[PDB]
Structure formats: structure tokens, C-alpha cells
A paper describes a structure:
The endoribonuclease [name]-like (Endoribonucleases specific for Uridylate) superfamily (IPR037227) is a poorly understood group of RNases found in bacteria, eukaryotes and viruses. Human [name] (hEndoU) was first identified as human [name] ([name]) due to its prevalence in the placenta. Our structural analysis revealed a calcium-stabilized interaction network involving residues from both the eukaryote-specific N-terminal extension and the catalytic core of [name], ultimately leading to the activation of the catalytic triad.
To elucidate the effect of calcium, we crystallized [name] with an excess of calcium and solved its structure at 1.7 Å resolution. The structure revealed five calcium ions, with one aiding crystal packing and four potentially activating the protein. Each calcium ion is coordinated by seven oxygen atoms from acidic side-chains, backbone carbonyl groups, or protein-stabilized water molecules. Comparing apo-XendoU, apo-[name], and calcium-activated [name] structures revealed conformational changes upon calcium binding that mainly cluster nearby protein loops. The side-chain of E290, located midway between site (1) and the catalytic triad, flips to engage with a water molecule in the calcium coordination network. The bonding correlates with a disorder-to-order transition in the loop carrying E290, forming a β-hairpin and stabilizing the catalytic site. Our data show a model for the calcium-dependent regulation of [name] through allostery, with site (1) and residue E290 as key mediators in the intramolecular signaling leading to [name] activation. Therefore, our work supports a model where calcium is not directly involved in catalysis but rather activates the catalytic His-His-Lys triad through allostery.
Numbering used by the authors: 134 to 408
The structure:
């Protein structure tokens, strides 16, 4: 069944209200500090001397979907050109993440919507497709299987001396805590006055610069995984107009176009919040 623009905006609001594992107001203290003009993002000047996350209540990271998500963030080599080889325990981490997110109201809402729209006949089929499109390996650089949709969006990569991808707040917080991310500034702070919020950030990640990295702030991993999958499944390759807490938010997805899985199906090249 065709998924309409109106149907996308209804399910995106259902996903937003169902996100009970999101950070509560008291679980994160943000310090956005200096905002610069979009014309100054190539300056590479650190205008924020304090970390972006002044405090995060790390008990949030004991929630099973956060623990399973964080367990995946040490499985990759950010520099493209280095093939990825997952251990049996690392493939079990992918299954554990998918099993944990499927227990949430967020993923139950998305699967129910997609099943009603006749895109998937079963949860098993849907989980298998998600595992392929997100965790399947493809080649961005010098070696085979150095990248994936999940690595690009959630872990972040370095290609040709610049940061590429890197759109997740938990990954940002954990690297910043280790001194591996240095927050420089933002150009945009979304209309939400609660979590999830959106910030468009400039930052240095262990020697490489990210010019405009838009990220949800305070969302659970299942919220982000559901919305990015919704945009990719319903509108692959296009800008999908979501509605979140009554405010519009546009997301771009692109298919990977150098390889396929199964019967000519596409891996996710990227999913991101547009400027
Ligand atoms: Ca429909
Ligand atoms: Ca791991
Ligand atoms: Ca990699
Ligand atoms: Ca700084
Ligand atoms: Ca805001």
C-alpha cells in the first residue's frame, strides 16, 4: 500500500509520543553556548570552551535499548579504507539491539503501521530486513566492507580528512567524555524546548572536523532507528517531512548504489536531519 505524506506525519507523531525511554528533562543538562552564522561553519574556531553535555544521568544508559546500542559503538574503525570483520559476539550484539528495540512501543507502532500498509507480512521479515539494510557491509573507501548505514549514521566515519556521518547524541556524549570530541559551536537549535531537541553542531572528532552535524538530543536509540527506517522504507532517496511534537522536521535518506543484498535490495547509505 502507498504510504502518503499525511500517513508519515501521523506515524512520526505516534513514534514521538511512544518514546517513553527518552531522556527526561532532568536527565541531560545541555550547554549550547555560542551560536554562529551558517556562513562561518568552515572557520574551524572553537567558540565553546565548555563541553556541550554538562551532565548526563548515566542511569539512562542501563535501559536495555541504550545498553544494546552502546555495545555496538565499539565494533567499528571510523576511517574508511579498513575492512570490518565482526566477531560472533559482535553479530550477537546486532541481534540483541534489534530484539530489545522490538520490545518498545516505538517499534511496535512502526511495525503495526508498516504491516497495515502491507510493506511487511511479519515481524521476523521486518527484523531481518532491518538487519540487512542497517548492519550489512559495503565499501566507501580502499577496502571491501569498510562501511554500513549503521556505522555511518550512529558511529561516524572519517573519509578524505573530514568527518562524515556522525548524527547521534549518545556517541557524541561518550566521545566528548573521553576527550575525543571537542564541541566548537552550533548554527541551529530546534523549536522543541524539551527532549528530543535538535542541534546543528560544529565539532572536532580526534583530529578531524565535522562542519554541520545535525542530531536529535535526548531521544532513545529506538526513536532514531524507527524514524530513520520509516523515512528509508517509505521514501528512499528523498527528503521525508516528519512532524514531531507539532513541529516539522525534514530527514534525507539515500540508498547505497555500489552493491545490493538479497533480491536487489538496497543498504542505507545515510539518514540525516536536513539543515
Ligand atoms: Ca496508505
Ligand atoms: Ca561491542
Ligand atoms: Ca568503518
Ligand atoms: Ca570546545
Ligand atoms: Ca530547542
Amino acid at each position: 500500500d502507498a504510504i502518503t505524506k499525511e500517513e508519515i506525519q501521523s506515524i512520526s507523531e505516534k513514534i514521538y509520543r511512544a518514546d517513553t525511554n527518552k531522556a527526561q528533562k532532568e536527565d541531560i543538562v545541555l550547554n549550547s553556548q555560542n551560536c554562529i552564522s551558517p556562513s562561518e561553519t568552515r572557520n574551524q574556531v572553537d567558540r565553546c570552551p565548555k563541553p556541550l553535555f554538562t551532565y548526563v544521568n548515566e542511569k539512562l544508559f542501563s535501559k536495555p535499548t541504550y545498553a544494546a546500542f552502546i555495545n555496538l559503538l565499539n565494533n567499528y574503525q571510523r576511517a574508511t579504507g579498513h575492512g570490518e570483520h565482526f566477531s560472533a559476539q559482535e553479530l550477537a550484539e546486532q541481534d540483541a539491539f534489534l530484539r530489545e528495540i522490538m520490545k518498545t512501543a516505538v517499534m511496535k507502532e512502526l511495525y503495526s503501521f508498516l504491516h497495515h500498509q502491507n510493506r511487511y507480512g511479519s515481524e521476523q521479515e521486518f527484523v531481518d530486513d532491518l538487519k540487512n539494510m542497517w548492519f550489512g557491509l559495503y565499501s566507501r573507501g580502499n577496502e571491501e566492507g569498510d562501511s554500513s548505514g549503521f556505522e555511518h549514521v550512529f558511529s561516524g566515519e572519517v573519509k578524505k580528512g573530514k568527518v562524515t556521518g556522525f548524527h547521534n547524541w549518545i556517541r557524541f556524549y561518550l566521545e566528548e567524555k573521553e576527550g575525543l570530541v571537542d564541541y566548537y559551536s552550533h548554527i541551529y537549535d530546534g523549536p522543541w524546548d524539551s527532549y528530543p531537541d535538535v542541534l546543528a553542531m560544529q565539532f572536532n572528532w580526534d583530529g578531524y572536523y565535522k562542519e554541520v552535524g545535525s542530531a536529535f538530543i535526548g531521544s532513545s536509540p529506538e526513536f532514531e532507528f524507527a524514524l530513520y527506517s520509516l523515512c528509508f522504507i517509505a521514501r528512499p532517496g528523498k527528503v521525508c517531512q516528519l512532524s514531531l511534537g507539532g513541529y516539522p522536521l525534514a530527514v534525507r535518506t539515500y540508498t547505497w548504489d555500489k552493491s545490493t543484498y538479497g533480491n536487489g535490495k538496497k543498504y542505507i547509505a545515510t539518514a540525516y536531519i536536513v539543515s
